[PDB]
């Protein structure tokens, strides 16, 4: 995770009324505004998620890693979203059981060859059971500071 752009305004708590399409469109807004991705970035993330899901049934907290083709990204970035209660995502492994996701790591990766690096970083982050449990209670700045340290 080298040169990944991440700010305090890339962290959000989404309300309890949201669907997955609302989550994707919410998490893309701060990226689209800064000019990190194209204007219709949300659409392509929604389209890909249907065909190729990004749900990871990890205990205790389910995790989503929604993204799209790298041609739609300009400058590398990541947007974190916390959910009030579980939202159902399809399993990325191809199991029929759903994934109750609470933490969403929206990836906007411009280089395809460093996708596996960002994924490996996420897997290491979501392995830390203590940190993941704290993400559910920490506020926007507390989450930024915790994650920003993990990137550096």
């Amino acid at each position: 995770m080298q040169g990944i752009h991440f700010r305090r305004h890339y962290v959000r708590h989404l309300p309890k009324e949201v669907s997955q399409n609302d989550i994707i469109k919410a998490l893309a807004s701060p990226l689209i505004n800064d000019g990190m991705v194209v204007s219709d970035f949300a659409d392509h993330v929604i389209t890909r998620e249907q065909n190729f899901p990004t749900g990871l049934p990890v205990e205790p907290v389910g995790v989503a890693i929604p993204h799209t083709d790298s041609k739609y990204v300009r400058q590398n970035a990541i947007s974190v979203g916390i959910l009030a209660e579980p939202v159902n995502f399809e399993d990325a492994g191809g199991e029929p059981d759903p994934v109750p996701v609470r933490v969403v790591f929206m990836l906007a990766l411009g280089n395809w060859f460093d996708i596996t690096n960002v994924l490996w970083w996420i897997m290491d982050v979501i392995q830390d059971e203590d940190f993941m449990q704290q993400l559910l209670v920490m506020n926007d700045d507390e989450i930024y500071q915790s994650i920003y340290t993990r990137i550096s």
Partner: antibody
Amino acid sequence: QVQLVQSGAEVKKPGSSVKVSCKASGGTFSSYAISWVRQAPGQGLEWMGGIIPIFGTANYAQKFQGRVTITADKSTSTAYMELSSLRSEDTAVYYCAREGTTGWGWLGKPIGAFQHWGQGTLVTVSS
Amino acid sequence: EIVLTQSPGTLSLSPGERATLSCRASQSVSSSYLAWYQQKPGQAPRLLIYGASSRATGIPDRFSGSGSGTDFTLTISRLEPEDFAVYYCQQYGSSPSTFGQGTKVEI
């Protein structure tokens, strides 16, 4: 330590299509990028495309976009490359290549550069 | 697309000497996305360097990479007869990944 066992050689007629397979072993399959690189008989290396199997879609080079199809079977740890509308130009040795890991054995992050290679699949196009 | 021009085209050296290979890029590639390969006849490429400077696992300290932006260089310090082969440079900072034409190191 990773093995990439490719399929046998193919003798194809012009206009037909070929499906070459790459069987991965010795490490995790879904969490790493598998690329396909070509080399004409007395020529240099040429990146066709690649796929990260946990995620869905393949990445393609613009020259091959339209007649190359790269897929990955999670349930058999086998990556495939299908090249359609075979021209005489397409006569080459086709390699599947998997990125390395920054560390000994199975340990560490991915490096991107292709540390592991298949034996090579020779495809010849002639009527 | 980014074109990688290698230099020299062919290089004949006696064993024990230092070989200096170059890889010129059409555009600036960040140092973290350039690799070097060795390929003997009738074999697959072998990864030497990956981080422009960083060594692949099991590769000796005889091989060393360096450079930034447009100019990159592979340096073989002490040439053994096993080292005489074709050497390629690769960019994977953006799609699609492109290779050099190759520098043949001869005896």
